[PDB]
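Deviations from the work plan: none for this task. Representative record:
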Amino acid sequence: QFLRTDDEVVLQCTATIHKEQQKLCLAAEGFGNRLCFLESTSNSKNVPPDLSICTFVLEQSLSVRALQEMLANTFMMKTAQGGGHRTLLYGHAILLRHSYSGMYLCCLSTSRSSTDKLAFDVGLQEDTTGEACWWTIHPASKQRSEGEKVRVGDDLILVSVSSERYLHLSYLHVDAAFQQTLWSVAPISSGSEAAQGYLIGGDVLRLLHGECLTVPSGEHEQRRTVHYEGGAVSVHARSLWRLETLRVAWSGSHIRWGQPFRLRHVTTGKYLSLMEDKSLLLMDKEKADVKSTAFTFRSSKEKRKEVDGMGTSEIKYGDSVCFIQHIGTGLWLTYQSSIQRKAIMHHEGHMDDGLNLSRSQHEESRTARVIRSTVFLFNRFIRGLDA
Amino acid sequence: NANVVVRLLIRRPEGLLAAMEEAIKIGNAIMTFYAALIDLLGRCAEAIRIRSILRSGDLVGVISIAFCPDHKAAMVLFLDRVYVQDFLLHLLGFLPDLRAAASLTDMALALNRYLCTAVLPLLLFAGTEHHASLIDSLLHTVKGCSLTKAQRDSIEVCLLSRPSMMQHLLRRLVFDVPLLNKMPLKLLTNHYERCWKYYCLPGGASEEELHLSRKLFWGIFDALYEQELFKLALPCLSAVAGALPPNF
């Protein structure tokens, strides 16, 4: 209902370009670029955007009086400072980090737009000890007040400390200036969320068999097939599937039997966009629809709706018998008959369709997203040379 | 007050510097009207997060016409407030000013006006030309209140430092001394012992000018209270020449 430290939300506007309700969230690059950017989440049922590039954790909300302690510092900002959860009040300076690349949100001393005299741009530094990273909170609500508790689902003006410029949104630019932007705060995961080894949303994981799955190697079909294997394919990057639910808020809640499943390969970034005729196909967000990406989980071959919170920590990873059913077909993932045995969505096929799982960790996923962005840069720059 | 109001003023000051010197061709309305803006802005001396915003590097009006009574002194104080010791002389600007020291009436009051902006640079070749323009303005007056004010700043600007041009201006007093022994520049003639002593350290034609200066000092000695005051410093000028030689 309210916000404390160690809390994960996002920031959105449904901003306008000619009466657009263009659900533009600020997404940061990281791990190779220090600038952030807008991200439309409107047609997410047919272009599901990334979320891991735009989620942020409330690192430390503090009083403005508390900041000059760090001025008096010339460590570890008293290591808490204080508690505790430090439940959110308006009129606070906050520290903010990226989730994924984990850069800390700061502004810039630059002018990388109009000009438009000396307003400022938005960066991602790692020296938190600097009030570009510090961000005073203003509700734009006389209906609300300042100093009071910050609820869920509010709308704010977030102003800098160094520049003390408001969060400006321009045209499509994100900057710091003497004009402001309201900001939705969609709750995602708080907190803690909730226990070790649980199907919790946003996860990347492996799909084991007892044996596991595989994608082919490189040298390209652009890995668009999917199979089974033993092998160190878990240790390979290709066994990595970032789950997404259709719910934009609370998407890092607990996953349960039969939630909507926007499912996406990591090393490509392509979604598991199921060809509805016979079996599995791979494409990016464009194909990723309720006919192609959205599946369900069933504990039996025979056999989610509404949660504004963390939900019920349903399944662990090793203790998982999940009969995945595509919603648009009712098929179930069985296999055909190098053990690169091809899996197939089907009515029955084999009776081994309640498969097994294992989550990932942060560094390996991080390197995977790095690899994806890496070759995205690389191959386009290669034909840059070729031109 | 300023601390508040500039934070208020992120909203509407109303390409502003694009057409800044635009309507000088075109009723002094917008020109003075933004001169008010810049003069008001230039009033700010930790809380110096402002200084970048105080600097939003706008230096066109410095060399706008480097009216010109009005605006340029406001630019002077603004630049002095918000913004090496010898770099600044490229901004002549005194190239119109100290050279325009005889234009015969906005000019005639900008004359006594800009002596404050002439003192204000109390805060390597063309400095001889700068001292030339300064001497042209000086003997153009040698308005007497602020002129006598700038008379103090002239000597410290002379000893402010190339240094060959500095010794050249140090004996520029001997250059003007050919008409001396007037009562106006008698104080400069008295204080010129300090300029000769300033040339005396690394510096000890020129010795011929020193002999002619000692001859002029002996001629001022028989030229006969202010002159009687400056005659004691003419002996100091002879001693500093000893330590030195070890409307045109």
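Residues 362-386 of chain A form the longest helix (25 residues).
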